């Protein structure tokens, strides 16, 4: 099952089918008219749903991964086709990751290229220094897992019981 597009491949007269590097069919010769066709399988994609909490809203957006938008508030990304979110030229922090630099947030659901950080230009010069005149005592938290749940399995009882 697949689309049959035009092929630029020049087959030799004795060859009938075509195979990929990984032994999957990629071409065929038509037996009625001696022309070459590029067998390409039909589109498939991983449907992913982008949603905020149900506490806030029930609007959702759908991402078809790897699918061009013409083969399915529709925006085309390198990740795939995003339906239900409107592209905004503004850049904000990443709220819901979409991929290829695109992130989504709820404000309706918007999709944008995420900003890496606030832009700061340091005033570098050959004879100027910046010296701190005060300090802040900052306490920060670091959470590290140490152990897991200790599990034992009775092989005979699990597989066979009584």
């Amino acid at each position: 099952t697949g689309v049959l597009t035009e092929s630029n491949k020049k087959f030799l007269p004795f060859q009938q089918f075509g195979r990929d590097i990984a032994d999957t069919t990629d071409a065929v010769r038509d037996p009625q008219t001696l022309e070459i066709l590029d067998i390409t399988p039909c589109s498939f994609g991983g449907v992913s749903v982008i949603t905020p909490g149900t506490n806030t809203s029930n609007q959702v957006a759908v991402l078809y991964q790897g699918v061009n938008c013409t083969e399915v508030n529709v925006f085309q990304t390198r990740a795939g086709c995003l339906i239900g979110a409107e592209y905004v030229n503004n850049s904000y922090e990443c709220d819901i990751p979409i991929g290829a630099g695109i992130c989504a947030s709820y404000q309706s659901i918007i999709a944008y290229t995420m900003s890496l950080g606030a832009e700061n230009s340091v005033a570098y010069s050959n004879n100027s220094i910046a010296i701190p005149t005060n300090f802040t005592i900052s306490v920060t938290t670091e959470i590290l897992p140490v152990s897991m749940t200790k599990t034992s399995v009775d092989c005979t009882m699990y597989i066979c019981g009584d």
Partner: protein
């Protein structure tokens, strides 16, 4: 905040639930219940059905043990990291950047948590920075003076020497500077006086 510990508890519970759920899988046999297979078929075919259930359940158990081993390796790496943080951040002061918090690390406090540890990193963060005009060395009496522990700063008209991480201007003297060479080699040297502590003493 506590997503890592809850995540570990979730993975362990989910793995046990999946392993328990896999007992209700036929695995290509007529039934998932062994008692039904014994009560319904003769030993020549019951042996085959029990074999199908055994191979499916054994594959499920091996899969569970394999993911348990991989998670055990991940938790062992995290525990080794936690032990290193406990040794270097709590039992001493660490000069490793970002290992014991953001900022210049001062000290750390351990707190027990379910299946884990929470480190309270007390760090020193510089703030309220001010611009100053700086020079590499001070030229006095044909000699180049360099700071022993600080940096030369100027507020516009006067030169002082201060510690690098806090602004505390002090008069440039021979006590806090050292002389190495003349003034002809250092690029950017400025002319300023260097006070002598002994000068009022012998003068009076």
């Amino acid at each position: 905040a506590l997503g890592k510990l809850q995540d570990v508890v979730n993975h362990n519970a989910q793995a046990l639930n999946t392993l328990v759920k896999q007992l209700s899988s036929k695995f290509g046999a007529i039934s998932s219940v062994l008692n039904d297979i014994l009560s319904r078929l003769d030993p020549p075919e019951a042996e085959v059905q029990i074999d199908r259930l055994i191979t499916g359940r054994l594959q499920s158990l091996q899969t569970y043990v394999t993911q348990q081993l991989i998670r055990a390796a991940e938790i062992r790496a995290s525990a080794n990291l936690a032990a290193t943080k406990m040794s270097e951040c709590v039992l001493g002061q660490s000069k490793r950047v970002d290992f014991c918090g953001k900022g210049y690390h001062l000290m750390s406090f351990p707190q027990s948590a379910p299946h884990g540890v929470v480190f309270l990193h007390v760090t020193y963060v510089p703030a309220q920075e001010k611009n100053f005009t700086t020079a590499p060395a001070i030229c006095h009496d044909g000699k180049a003076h360099f700071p022993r522990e600080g940096v030369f700063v100027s507020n516009g008209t006067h030169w002082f020497v201060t510690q690098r991480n806090f602004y505390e201007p002090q008069i440039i003297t021979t006590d806090n500077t050292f002389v190495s060479g003349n003034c002809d080699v250092v690029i950017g040297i400025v002319n300023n006086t260097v006070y002598d502590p002994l000068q009022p003493e012998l003068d009076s």
